[PDB]
A paper describes a structure:
Ferritins are iron storage proteins that overcome the problems of toxicity and poor bioavailability of iron by catalyzing iron oxidation and mineralization through the activity of a diiron ferroxidase site. The capacity of cells to store iron in a bioavailable and safe form is a central feature of the strategy nature has evolved to overcome the dual problem of poor bioavailability of iron and the potential of the free metal to catalyze the formation of reactive radical species. This function is fulfilled by the ubiquitous ferritin family, members of which are composed of 24 subunits arranged to form a protein shell surrounding a hollow center. Bacterioferritins (BFRs) constitute a distinct sub-family of ferritins, found only in bacteria, which contain a markedly different diiron ferroxidase site. Unlike in other ferritins, the oxidized di-Fe3+ site of [name] [name] (EcBFR) is stable and therefore does not function as a conduit for the transfer of Fe3+ into the storage cavity, but instead acts as a true catalytic cofactor that cycles its oxidation state while driving Fe2+ oxidation in the cavity.
The EcBFR ferroxidase site is flanked by two Tyr residues (Tyr25 and Tyr58) that are ∼4.0–6.5 Å away from the nearest iron, and by a Trp residue (Trp133), which is ∼9.7 Å away from site FeB. [name] also contains five other Tyr and one other Trp, which are located further from the ferroxidase site. We sought to determine whether these aromatic residues are involved in coupling electron transfer to oxidation of Fe2+. Site-directed variants, in which each residue was substituted with Phe, were generated and the mineralization activity of the variant proteins was determined. [name] exhibited an initial rate 50 % that of wild type [name]. X-ray crystal structures were determined for the [name], Y114F, and Y149F variants. These, along with previously reported structures of W35F and W133F BFRs and Y25F and Y58F [name] subunit dimers, showed that the substitutions did not cause any significant changes beyond the substituted side chain. EPR studies of the EcBFR variants revealed that Tyr25 is the site of radical formation; only in Y25F was the Tyr radical not observed.
Author numbering:
A (entry chain E), B (entry chain L), C (entry chain L), D (entry chain C), E (entry chain D), F (entry chain F), ...: 1 to 157
The structure:
């Protein structure tokens, strides 16, 4: 069913955001795993899977609307070298992605693609959940100190 | 069954105390939850429910005694913005409420409302339990330090 | 995640509505219970719990958005002393709350807080359900007469 | 298998009757549901489903006999505005349909379409069951009065 | 609860669309069944049931909003005589219905009937699913040829 | 445990190959899904997951050997526009990856990194399995004709 | 089966390494147990068991190849007096053992004893696992501090 060209361009942009996040979350998870921070490996791995599911939704929607999903152009990763830097980078990526989602959701409504909008609002809800988790972890590092925080990650939850 | 008017007035005063505690404990719980302190969310939420049960008992007793439960007047909440301050505020409210319960229990005996007295003694036992918990948690903060204390709240017990 | 200040103000206004409804529905429930109208106690108690769940959603959303939930200010309760008056009071409160929800939902869209909007639309759906129930019960009182209506409430459904 | 043209015409006429009844029973059911008359919603919904099954049997039989089922022409609905009016309209429709069935059953026999006749006799038995129910309900309204009758519908049976 | 008159008119228009689709899908299903194309009977029957569920939602919503559901006026069916014609007719109907839904969803938002809008977006999501299936089947006929396509329909999936 | 620099460089090269394959297999799967070729969606999705598992092993090994996994640079995808083109592109990618694996396996042996070699030989065994599947499917098109081949993909196996 | 004399000599050298590790890991485990560090007792005990399994494999392979297993000559143990010293000693022993394994694996390949090589590569994979664990624990001591690290060992994982 032929979709709106600009909506498709938005969906590809958002798909691009998800592709960056899949890779960044996955590498972060395995860095945490290497360091023995099992709890962080578990959550970050889950977050990577969440972004994979989002990517899947975008790919399927773009194809339905007769566009071409772009999985070729990968945007900049920002890995970081310690736990705080890594979590802050993930948070910054989530916030940038949320800005893009808000713009796309408004545009989709303007051209009456209400199903694409519905899909995007559900994805935005998930992303705000990730933002909540990341913000909370970063605040916990400050409150209990890094040494206690790291100790709290070595066992699975 | 028409009860003693002054007893009913005490029951409304005690109900008023419970209404403040329900809101204060619930807001505290969700603040702890937002901060990732899952254990404190669980206990404080449970405390809010316990106060709801007490409020229910007062409401049902007042109605049986043919009085009018007052759920309109809400006393002062003292929320606070750090864990120790929040727990100290809950403790202060519990101690104030216990004073009122003691007065009401004595008065109920003097006019032979032994069933209202029995109910209030059970509630006072519950409140002394909350006081014990709050006092103990506050002492633990002092003894192990806030950073260790916070670390100990992140996982559910 | 810092949210839109006016959205947060709407969320506090809506929370305020829920706080009134929680108390009004709960007191109504226990009045019905005292009168032996078990069915009405059950439904109104359930309605009180539903409003508690809504209040929880507002509190958690406001905290995520870095606002301060207001549980201190309690609006006017309208209790009433006969079944029809009580149900009409609940209906009036629901209709007033629905008006406020519509305003908030429109505003949230205008500032692109699509997740708060989604949450509020789900809550509005719940409230229209309560409105439907209340309207229907009031019409049943008229159609079968209050005496038959009361008889129909004494056994739990 | 090429059937008799006039038999197929009768089957299309009867299909037409069923299409009217499906819609009338279904709207009545949901009107009863809106009014809180759960028992009447349940029975009338089931009667709508019964007529749907009858329509299915006519459609399949017409296609087997190499005719063209007519689902395009919809006869007059008579909805009504109160319970007695609605039930009386349903009864009138059933009686009109039974008249048509009797004519078709006789004709099918005369041209030796015994399988179509067998199908129609089964459908007629179902319709007489609906007639019995409707007549009985209408008599109950008179015997116990409308107020009692309505009270008797508010719980599912 | 009194709804917006134009919203109710939209809901009746959409209901009318569903009523056409129910009949068209159902007759198509039984045509496929008569021809031994079991897979197509199964899917098209399921599609007819989907549209019945949509019609139910419209009827209930219209009644809640104190309007009068119109089940009397049935729009034009376009049946078709072979598989490709039938599927293309279903697709054209779905696309026409989607146009009407988009207009209604925009209007509902403008008068703040957010619950009616939410319902319609869910229905539109269902309709786009049907469109996807129909488009895909029509393309399959082209890719593998009609004879192979028909062979693939004789068993249930 | 500090690894050999050139081994780490090989592991990053192979990781790169896996990253291209994950995306190409996944998009191919969803193109097949869009087209209704459920069998091909299922297998190609499974292959994408297999390549994700391979990427995970490379990432974990690189981190153990104290290197930096490179998930930033993404090589050329060759998507294709029809089933045969897509399968041929997947086969060419697998063959190019197998060449790189053979070179890496020989080199790892030469510097005595027998555990990296063991890992790579297992991955190569998996890749030869994919090559077998792709070659077999392409030959099936040749043997039965494209239309028969496509028909054979519509049901899940 | 008459084995290669130098292969047997390598297997005896590696067996010697395992015999030292069995004793060192076991004594370390029980020192940790005495100190109340239950988690470290558990892991180090399991490491001792793993080395016993390795020793068993060498003994059985040597006997198959018609050589004489040497369990008489025990190399130098380096016990250590505190947690960090103990773990560093285990790490040093593992690294020395891995050096010997790499030499043996290369030689076995060169004289075509591929089954001894296969066995040794599996053992080397196990040893690299131990190395990973030891490195990770030593880094955790630095990152969370010794006091936190010790606290984290008192409960079984």
């Amino acid at each position: 069913m032929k979709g709106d060209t600009k909506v498709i361009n938005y969906l590809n942009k958002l798909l691009g955001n998800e592709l960056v996040a899949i890779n960044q979350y996955f590498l972060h998870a395995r860095m945490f795993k290497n360091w023995g921070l099992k709890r962080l490996n578990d959550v970050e791995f889950h977050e990577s899977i969440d972004e994979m599911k989002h990517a899947d939704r975008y790919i399927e929607r773009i194809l339905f609307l007769e566009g071409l999903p772009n999985l070729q152009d990968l945007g900049k990763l920002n890995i970081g070298e310690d736990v705080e830097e890594m979590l802050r980078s993930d948070l910054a990526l989530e916030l940038d992605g949320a800005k893009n989602l808000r713009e796309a959701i408004g545009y989709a409504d303007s051209v009456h693609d209400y199903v694409s909008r519905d899909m995007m609002i559900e994805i935005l809800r998930d992303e705000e959940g990730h933002i909540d988790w990341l913000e909370t972890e970063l605040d916990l590092i400050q409150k209990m100190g890094l040494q206690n925080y790291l100790q709290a990650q070595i066992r699975e939850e």
